[PDB]
């Protein structure tokens with residue numbers, strides 16, 4: 001069982017996973033294109049992340 | 052464990068190996084940007100491939 | 103609704119879903135029953151073990167080869183035998199370890215995977231087709247939905263060929279039964295529970311509801327019947343009449359209930 | 360509800376359960392939330408593993 | 411266990427008030443739009459610390 | 462396989478069992494819709510609980 | 513379930529088995 | 545073909561009004577129906593919101609039986625709010 | 630306060646035009662800048678789209694140096710399209 005957990009995959013897959021858990025905090029720069037991308041984004045995942 | 056998880060092996064011959072072997076023939080389209088790229092390329096490997 | 107607006111009927115009593123478009127034309131009493139859009143599939147076959155599942159981990163070739171190897175070792179011993187016993191021990195050691203490991207892999211894999219959790223999983227896979235009724239509140243919900251998952255699902259359903267839409271509930275359920283679990287039917291939780299409690303009981307509801315809404319008794323706008331009916335539904339609600347009625351028709355006489 | 364009937368407030372927005380006794384004096388919007396009477400207990404610290 | 415009974419909350423307005431139908435239709439709109447759902451997820455689950 | 466699964470289920474006594482035992486005391490708010498539900502309840506179990 | 517049929521991998525241990533039995537036949541022969 | 549929300553608004557109020565004119569004395573009751581028809585005829589950026597929501601609410605809260613003309617004349621200039629949400 | 634897509638449009642065209650006026654003779658270059666300023670001042674339902682997108686496009690392709698007045702007079706009535714996405 002232990003070794004099966006050891007070789008087991010999927011620790012992290014996508015960006016969506018960050019949106020689905022509050023355990024790991026995450027962030028961007030205080031300014032620049034990225035923060036603005038999250039700000040102006042109307043697509044679900046990134047919107048949630050920005051909120 | 053390793054039977055439960057299995058695995059995936061991904062081979063890479065990349066570009067240069069094509070230059071290094073006559074066993075596997077290779078080619079491009081009769082025309083277009085790719086052919087022109089190989090033609091006008093001043094880089095060693097691509098030059099050889101074009102030749 | 104038409105019969106109510108145009109005055110061909112004084113009241114409408116039926117599993118009529120409360121929607122804003124309907125609330126604009128008619129008046130809805132407080133909901134007498136709760137429902138939501140849910141997913142119905144074919145329940146996986148419990149067990150088809152055979153005696154072949156024991157010979158599944160170890161290949162037929164391995165059994166034949168271990169038999170010939172066994173008789174080979176016997177006829178070798180018939181003709182020093184220390185290394186024979188040792189080598190055979192190593193052989194059967196690696197083989198029993200391999201069998202144990204492989205079978206462990208089988209059972210672990212079998213216990214690890216789950217077919218479907220929510221609607222989001224339905225949106226993320228093209229393997230299992232899914233659909234709704236040709237008309238009604240559910241189709242309209244998917245159409246009018248600005249929510250990501252539901253939007254994607256709607257795009258898929260409308261674009262998908264052959265059509266995933268069915269005319270009747272019985273047709274949809276029948277399609278779920280005939281498709282060997284390759285077809286999922288989206289229907290309100292009520293009907294899902296009812297069909298799930300009825301034989302052959304090969305169908306089941308997975309995950310929660312996509313949305314939370316209710317049925318209601320409809321009366322023409324400005325009718326005298328509205329407030330009495332509403333207060334009546336409240337009375338039946340507090341008295342528990344609605345609950346006992348649902349248990350009566352759904353669960354209690356349920357054969358597989 | 361009292362503030363509503365006697366006109367001390369124009370509207371009441373709160374986890375106000377819909378009841379017939381309340382539905383007689385005032386008007387309730389369609390329910391914005393679903394609930395029901397349920398039982399709350401102390402979660403067991405451990406589960407006896409057993410033989 | 412389950413719930414003992416099934417009922418709901420609601421926004422209360424004086425009988426014969428002009429706000430009543432607008433409030434009702436508003437709650438329906440917010441309901442279909444999923445505003446109620448997202449709000450509940452906001453206050454209850456999203457910042458939920460117990461996982 | 463079992464050990465690799467790591468599935469943990471927590472049983473419940475639900476509503477019906479609560480009426481059948483004097484070991485665990487239980488209660489509601491001093492007033493409100495819940496207390497009134499128990500008070501006016503014509504259902505056996507709930508009646509017993511109220512008594 | 514992903515049926516294994518791992519015979520190819522075990523075949524090697526079968527080969528070291530046959531090798532061991534061969535050396536065994538050799539020792540049995542040099543003995544007599 | 546672009547919808548142009550302003551033209552959508554003028555059309556919205558126009559169709560609502562023209563519809564409500566057909567129902568005399570029942571004007572306050574059919575506001576939502578005629579608003580439905582107007583959203584249908586003039587189109588909408590969001591099917592739920594409708595062509596102009598603020599005007600709809602304004603009419604619903606203001607309009608009394610036989611009071612149609614003045615009510616509409618009051619409500620047609622009002623801000624429609626967010627047309628996409 | 631409440632948003633009005635129509636008021637947003639009228640304000641949009643007015644502010645764009647008024648902006649381009651200081652840039653007279655370089656007008657064809659600054660269309661997008663003045664559109665940005667107008668989007669900021671008159672507000673927008675979608676930050677990307679702006680107050681009126683169709684007018685922006687019309688101006689961008691039509692406007693020639695010193696040809697401003699006629700260009701704006703032609704483009705201000707143009708349909709703004711969907712101010713959602």
Ligand SMILES: CC(C)S(=O)(=O)NC[C@H](C)c1ccc(-c2ccc([C@@H](C)CNS(=O)(=O)C(C)C)cc2)cc1
Nearest residue numbers: 132133135136314315316389390392393416417418
């Ligand atoms: C159409 C929507 C605006 S909505 O359905 O009203 N609101 C959505 C929200 C999530 C919701 C959805 C459904 C219900 C709900 C709650 C209870 C019931 C039944 C079982 C009891 N009827 S009753 O109205 O509560 C009673 C006290 C008479 C039926 C529906 C309560 C709240």
Ligand SMILES: C=C(C)[C@H]1CN[C@H](C(=O)O)[C@H]1CC(=O)O
Nearest residue numbers: 028029031032033034035036037
């Ligand atoms: C490194 C910085 C601050 C720049 C570089 N590119 C982005 C930009 O051009 O705004 C910024 C990074 C970012 O926004 O994540």
Ligand SMILES: C=C(C)[C@H]1CN[C@H](C(=O)O)[C@H]1CC(=O)O
Nearest residue numbers: 079080081082083084085086087
């Ligand atoms: C399909 C053809 C010939 C086109 C497509 N893109 C390249 C182009 O835009 O030229 C060409 C492909 C290539 O150059 O390999």
Ligand SMILES: C=C(C)[C@H]1CN[C@H](C(=O)O)[C@H]1CC(=O)O
Nearest residue numbers: 117118119237238239240241290
């Ligand atoms: C069973 C049918 C066709 C009805 C029942 N409630 C929904 C309604 O009131 O339209 C319909 C089903 C649905 O759309 O999920």
Ligand SMILES: C=C(C)[C@H]1CN[C@H](C(=O)O)[C@H]1CC(=O)O
Nearest residue numbers: 374375376490492493494495496
């Ligand atoms: C929290 C309180 C005191 C309120 C809230 N809803 C119930 C009601 O609307 O009466 C009451 C709780 C209860 O009755 O247990």
